[PDB]
Amino acid sequence: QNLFNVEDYRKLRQKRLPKMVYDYLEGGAEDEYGVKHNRDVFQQWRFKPKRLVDVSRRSLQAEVLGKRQSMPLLIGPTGLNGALWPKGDLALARAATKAGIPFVLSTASNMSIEDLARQCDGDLWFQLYVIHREIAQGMVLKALHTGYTTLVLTTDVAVNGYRERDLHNRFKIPMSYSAKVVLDGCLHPRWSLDFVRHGMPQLANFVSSQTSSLEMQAALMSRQMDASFNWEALRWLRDLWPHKLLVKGLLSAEDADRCIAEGADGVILSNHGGRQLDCAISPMEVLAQSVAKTGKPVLIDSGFRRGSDIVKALALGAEAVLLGRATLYGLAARGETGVDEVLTLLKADIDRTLAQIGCPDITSLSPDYLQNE
Amino acid sequence: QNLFNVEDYRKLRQKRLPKMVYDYLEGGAEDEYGVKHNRDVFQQWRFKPKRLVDVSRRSLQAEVLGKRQSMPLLIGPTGLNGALWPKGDLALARAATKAGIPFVLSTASNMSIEDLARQCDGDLWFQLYVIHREIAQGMVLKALHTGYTTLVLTTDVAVNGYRERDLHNRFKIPMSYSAKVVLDGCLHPRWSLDFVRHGMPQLANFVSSQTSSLEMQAALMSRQMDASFNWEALRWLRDLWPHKLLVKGLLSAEDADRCIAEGADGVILSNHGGRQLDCAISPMEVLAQSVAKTGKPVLIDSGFRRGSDIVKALALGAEAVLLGRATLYGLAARGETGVDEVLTLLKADIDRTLAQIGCPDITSLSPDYLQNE
Amino acid sequence: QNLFNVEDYRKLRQKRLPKMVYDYLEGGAEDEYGVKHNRDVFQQWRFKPKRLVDVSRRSLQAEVLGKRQSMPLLIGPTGLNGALWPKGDLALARAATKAGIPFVLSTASNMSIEDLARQCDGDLWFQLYVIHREIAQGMVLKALHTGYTTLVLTTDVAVNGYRERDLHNRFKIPMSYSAKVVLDGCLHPRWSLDFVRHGMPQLANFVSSQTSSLEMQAALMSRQMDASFNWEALRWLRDLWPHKLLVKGLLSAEDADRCIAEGADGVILSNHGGRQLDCAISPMEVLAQSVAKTGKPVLIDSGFRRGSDIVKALALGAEAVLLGRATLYGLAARGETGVDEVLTLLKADIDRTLAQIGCPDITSLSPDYLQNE
Amino acid sequence: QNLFNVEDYRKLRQKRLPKMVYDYLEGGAEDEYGVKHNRDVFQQWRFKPKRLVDVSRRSLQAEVLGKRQSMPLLIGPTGLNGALWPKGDLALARAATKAGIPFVLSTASNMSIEDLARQCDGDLWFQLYVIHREIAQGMVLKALHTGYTTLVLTTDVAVNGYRERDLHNRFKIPMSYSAKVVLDGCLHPRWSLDFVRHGMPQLANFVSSQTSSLEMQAALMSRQMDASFNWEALRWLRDLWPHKLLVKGLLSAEDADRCIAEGADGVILSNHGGRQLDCAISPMEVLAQSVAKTGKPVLIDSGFRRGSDIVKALALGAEAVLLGRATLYGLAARGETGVDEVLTLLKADIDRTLAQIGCPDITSLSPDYLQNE
Ligand SMILES: CCCCCCCCCCCCO[C@@H]1O[C@H](CO)[C@@H](O[C@H]2O[C@H](CO)[C@@H](O)[C@H](O)[C@H]2O)[C@H](O)[C@H]1O
Ligand SMILES: CCCCCCCCCCCCO[C@@H]1O[C@H](CO)[C@@H](O[C@H]2O[C@H](CO)[C@@H](O)[C@H](O)[C@H]2O)[C@H](O)[C@H]1O
Ligand SMILES: Cc1cc2nc3c(=O)[nH]c(=O)nc-3n(C[C@H](O)[C@H](O)[C@H](O)COP(=O)(O)O)c2cc1C
Ligand SMILES: Cc1cc2nc3c(=O)[nH]c(=O)nc-3n(C[C@H](O)[C@H](O)[C@H](O)COP(=O)(O)O)c2cc1C
Ligand SMILES: Cc1cc2nc3c(=O)[nH]c(=O)nc-3n(C[C@H](O)[C@H](O)[C@H](O)COP(=O)(O)O)c2cc1C
Ligand SMILES: Cc1cc2nc3c(=O)[nH]c(=O)nc-3n(C[C@H](O)[C@H](O)[C@H](O)COP(=O)(O)O)c2cc1C
Ligand code: NA
Ligand code: NA
Secondary structure (H helix, E strand, C coil), X not given: CXXXXXXXXXXXXXXXXXXXXXXXXXXXXCCCHHHHHHHHHHHHCEECCCCCCCCCCCECCEEECCEEECCCEEECCCCCHHHCCCXXXXXXHHHHHHCCCXXXXXXXXXXXXXXXXXXXCCCEEEEEECECHHHHHHHHHHHHHCCXXXXXXXXXXXXXXXXXXXXXXXXXCCCCCCHHHHHHHHCCHHHHHHHHHHCCCCCHXXXXXXCCCHHHHHHHHHHHECCCCXXXXXXXXXXXXXXXXXXXXXXXXXXXXXXXXXXXXXXXXXXXXXXXXXXXXXXXXXXXXXXXXXXXXXEECCCCCCHHHHHHHHHHCCCCEEECXXXXXXXXXXXXXXXXXXXXXXXXXXXXXXXXXXXXXXXXXXXXHEECC | CCCCCHHHHHHXXXXXXXXXXXXXXXXXXXXXXXXXXXXXXXXXXXXXXXXXXXXXXXXXXXXXXXXXXXXXXXXXXXXXXXXXXXXXXXXXXXXXXXXXXXXXXXXXXXXXXHHHHHHCCCCEEEEEECECHHHHHHXXXXXXXXXXXXXXXXXXXXXXXXXXXXXXXXXXXXXXXXXXXXXXXXXCHHHHHHHHHHCCCCCHHHCCCCCCCHHHHHHHHHHHECCCCCHHHHHHHXXXXXXXXXXXXXXXXXXXXXXXXXXXXXXXXXXXXXXXXXXXXXXXXXXXXXXHXXXXXXXXXXXXXXXXXXXXXXXXXXXXXXECHHHHHHHHHHHHHHHHHHHHHHHHHXXXXXXXXXCCEHHHCCHHHEECC | CCCCCHHHHHHHHHHHCCXXXXXXXXXXXXXXXXXXXXXXHHHXXXXXXXXXXXXXXXXXXXXXXXEEECCCEEECCCCCHHHCCCCHHHHHHHHHHHCCCCEEEECCCCCCHHHHHHHCCCCEEEEEECECHHXXXXXXHHHHHCCCCEEEEECCCCCCCCCHHHHHHCCCCCCCCCHHHHHHHHCCHHHHHHHHHHCCCCCHHHCCCCCCCHHHHHHHHHHHECCCCCXXXXXXXXXXXXXXXXXXXXXXHHHHHHXXXXXXXXXXXXXXXXXXXXXXXXXXXXXXXXXXXXXXXXXXXXXXXXXXXXXXXXXXXXXXXXXXXXXXXXXHHHHHHHHHHHHHHHHHHHHHHHHHHCCCEHHHCCHHHEECC | CCCCCHHHHHHHHHHHCCHHHHHHHHCCCCCCHHHHHHHHHHHHCEECCCXXXXXXXXXCCEEECCEEECCCEEECCCCCXXXXXXXXXXXXXXXXXHCCCCEEEECCXXXXXXXXXXXXXXXXXXXXXXXXXXXXXXXXXXXXXXXXCEEEEECCCCCCCCCHXXXXXXXXXXXXXXXXXXXXXXXXXXXXXXXXXXXXXXXXXXXXXXXXXXXXXXXXXXXXXXXXCCHHHHHHHHHHCCCEEEEEEECCHHXXXXXXXXXXXXXXXXXXXXXXXXXXXXXXXXXXXXXXXXCCCEEECCCCCCHHXXXXXXXXXXXXXXXXXXXXXXXXXXXXXXXXXXXXXXXXXXXXXXXXXXCCEXXXXXXXXXXXX
């Protein structure tokens, strides 16, 4: 284990995964100015430590939507985790659970709402795309009836982002074979062996006797995307769903406030990890405004790789941070154990950062610890 | 092939064109800080999407100078397109009309005012350089009588810009042969064959028994450039031309306002794609100001390569964007089909961008969708 | 040789030291954005020279904590200098005294408090880490009774910084052998020979019959670090120590002011040379503010390599600058002579800088000689 | 002649000159952040052209210190031009004269005050270092008696800058032979042949039967530098010199104003081409302030390579721009003809720039043509 940070796991993923799958994981939209901006924006703050503060007893635990967890991270929703590691959705969820944090299941998961709730008893969240009311109500109810605590509505994939790595690779659900496909698979024998042994992953929440192939399932899922979803549909969802409701994919304090007005319990500021709109702002640019404007839980993702990144968001008011690629690196490098190791480092990293800035209780973070640069 | 954006066609044009011709198309003035700045300035804005907006039915069509077109782009005027592809002016013109947008013919075209109007029935514009009243009145009249709808006066080539790529290549109108020339032509057989079969392109609006070679046509054209053209000459032109009149090459709101005061119907903010003055501002720096100061159509060019670039200019108030090199890459790679394809990508790209930022009708764009950085 | 500045000695140290030891000396925390920022920040000021000032007689001497020295530098505290050169602590100490400046011995030195005082008669300072009162009182007392004039309390190593060079190299106190270790030692025969002849360096202030190996000494030292050290413990130390007391590792004027309030004689602004917290501010960002807020001696370190760096800190109000790596490069390249030489270059460099900016007496420096940029 | 700008001549110099001489010409002080800043600062302004202005008749001529010249450039003072080209001082002066502009002779020239006035009838300036009154009065009077019109006092070389290229090369007046010297001379046969044919250049203003070698002359010149020269000595000089007096090497409006108060007719803002103090401001940073503060001629140098650079200084108020390296490139590349060609380009370049920004009369330049960026 010569692995000391998230980036060491990224490097390991790139060796195990075929170029085509790594490009699906790593790529962003168009020129990828956005993913770069998602990282660079964190250099806009530096730390002003408070010295001679007793930090001998540190606590990372905190309340997210009124419920205590061991640190303010979550494993956020990502589709097709089964391309990365067998039963990857369950790997992630078990690691989140051992680490004391929630896991968010994707509409596009390779393991169904119900199979995951049957095999793991952590705090499971479900994320729903913007889709047409009928089959949406079908998923929401399966999540209700199996004990999912909070529902996430992702609003930033009405239409698909223009990801040119996937276009250059021809990475699309009807795959077939190719000079490049076979070659890519052959130079990555560990993954290909895993792939033959276990088979093509399925869009498990679209499976049935009648839609029994991936090509069939994806076609159904894209037919269900609803680019007309508006504030009215959100009220419909608020009324259908009795527990915690969050709106994901927002990039303004104004939309954040409107979501709360229509009944949301909180929001997730996000640009989908730079995968949807290359020239979108980072959510860090509207965090403090959205926190000040709403007074309700503001969570955030997009670009987080280091404990200092996370700490900066928490000091500006964020209730918690969702990990996408960071823990996905652990998954495809080393499976469920990889995810455990990444969360173990990030916890140690957050904990070390709190020590060095003189703030022993994570809930007492504030901009006072930041220099604006 | 793998052609998914404008840059992929640049790569393709660079392979087909001989180095000297590629350098005439691509180059800018002196150090080329200006062409660089023309691209970089677009990073001064990022997008704040509005979510939970119905974007299932999008419209790109808009009024330019009171006339509806399918999207707010134009193929702007560029000279010597016949160096890029046989009958290059008509190719560009036929593609613009299929796509539903105007095409602007250059004073320096390889096909004459009249011959283009006899071969294309789109919305044709004519651009006139600052030149001496006599032969200017001649071209203006040919254009009026052949049904051109709009006249644009280009005001930024009083003197020739200092383009050091052409100087180092010895790319000048008395060409002759050389070790390098022949070598360049021989390494580009598709283009050289096209050139041998079809001959030396000619300045078609300067052809006559007396100026029967390209050298004589260019000698005449540069002797006709009139660095004294002032506000008086503009009024003279305004009285001579009864239809829509635009002034191109402005880089201040004050000059824009004066152009409107002297009867112009609108302006084109431009620095000639960085080809005339390396240290000129980008026209994006004075776009919002010119829109507020004149209240008349403000169009713009210089630097546009991505749909996101175009959308940012439209949200700051521009009526439309003219393309120079972007559609010239398609022309020089694959002719009229290449041009079609580039316009097809840019229309889809603009449309996708509108979807992602939550603005379904292009006419409702505003700075509200922008963050200034 | 061709040794004309500090960087030339870095190049020389890098050739003699094995890669693992060079990485312990050179490395910083995590991404090393901090060490980079420590250098770059000096570019935020440029010089406005005053001309037609008589600068024929220049003086570098100045009062630090009321005591005259030949120039306003100190060799600050660094641990494990014996890894760089035999008797490295004494070499540094003997060179400082020849140059007329204090030397600060580290808690983590390879030569004991008492043995250094028996072998050098300069102005010796002792730096104490934040540790448990019992053995702290022991070292403080050894230093008082052996004639140390100043005590500095380093407050920024509650927890160890995350230095990934050492982790990737497996550079840890239970070392052992390896393919890479032996290879590294064999490619650096001068250093390896020195190491074989002289043995494993020891934490000399933690030596006893029971902690008779380096592993045991380091085990003891890290168990003695006291993350609870607070303002109360500082008063305790203030009463225990009768002479000059400084607090090192501060990064705010507010903490500086509190340190003065609790009896300290001055402070050292520091981020431990970027080794503890990658995203910490440079202390130059809070230098002028700390000087104005306390009105007491404000010293500084972190990033200094050029005489111009030093002069800029002095014009903003700093009483003196401590050197870490700069004089360690001289030590590891050429021992006590290397250290002498580096101090000789830096004194000449400071003196030349004063000549060029028209300020003949170092004590009259002021921001008036600076432009903020 | 494939030479279209100053940089093409720099490239040519580097091939003809031995590395050691090129490094003396090109190098700056220490890290050479200063020369880089001297270039980069010009990117802080861009141009806002005025359109539809009659620029058919352009004039470059202007008054410098009340005397008309053909363009507001000067060839400024540089020592050891005879290392670059035989009788280089006379080459430069003849080119300045054919181009209609003054030439400034250096104290450190390879041709004496009197020999140059005997062989060229242009507008000759003399620059004097800060030196001890006696031999200074000897040079000032020779310049007076031979018709030099203006005297320049250079105040920024009290002590020598720390130029590490010269230190690495051992480029010092007692040269001798060496592995590197002979090798350098052998790989540059054109220059070495020139050097044997004509001999070691001499500090011609320090020549006599008694100080008849370069080693003797340089020793005398460095003994005469007077780091005590102050405002009193300046008044002495003002009284000794009856014609125009300028003070060179200033970097503040305050010193500029003081020079005028003590009788100077104007100042030259300069940092000696980045050769004296790496971290000095560019003089462009205090140009507009010095122009506004004094109301007397403010000239400038340091960093000028392009006509746009020059134009920007003139629009901020500068009376004229002195060239150092720019015309020295022409000299060592191609002798007197090289200097002619460089000035011909720069005139064409200034003239083209005025056309493109719509300002036909150079005296009507103003900040109105600039955008601050
Ligand atoms: C405009 C909208 C377009 C829709 C965009 C949809 C993009 C989604 C990408 C679909 C990829 C389907 O995910 C599927 O995963 C399987 C197993 O995990 C992998 O399987 C495939 O890739 C590997 C690459 O070496 C090959 O060895 C294998 O033979 C091939 O079938 C691919 O990853 C893909 O077949
Ligand atoms: C601290 C202050 C130090 C004082 C600084 C003084 C630096 C000044 C540099 C002095 C160089 C004297 O300039 C003199 O020029 C002659 C002819 O032009 C050149 O002559 C020399 O260089 C060339 C290099 O190839 C050799 O071939 C030749 O044999 C050698 O003598 C050198 O340039 C130098 O000898
Ligand atoms: C491969 C991949 C698949 C994703 N799938 C989904 C998804 O199915 N549903 C969703 O709401 N967000 C999805 N996301 C977005 C993440 O939830 C999250 O917003 C993003 O990854 C955070 O950016 P980061 O990767 O830099 O941490 C996906 C992200 C990636 C990288
Ligand atoms: C090869 C080339 C030729 C051009 N010729 C003309 C021209 O003849 N008349 C004109 O008004 N503008 C001309 N232009 C400028 C363009 O009309 C347009 O202003 C510029 O290309 C826009 O910048 P862009 O290439 O970055 O899109 C030319 C540009 C290029 C690159
Ligand atoms: C190898 C090394 C060891 C150090 N050891 C100590 C130490 O033991 N105690 C301490 O207070 N500071 C220690 N420091 C920090 C230095 O005292 C000083 O604050 C820092 O080196 C200044 O930055 P600079 O290297 O850029 O000059 C150490 C620094 C280095 C590089
Ligand atoms: C090789 C060289 C020698 C110089 N010698 C002198 C000199 O003897 N006296 C003087 O006043 N300035 C001298 N200068 C400074 C120039 O006069 C001028 O200030 C500087 O070169 C302008 O910067 P630039 O080279 O970027 O144009 C010298 C500059 C160079 C590069
Ligand atoms: Na299910
Ligand atoms: Na003389």
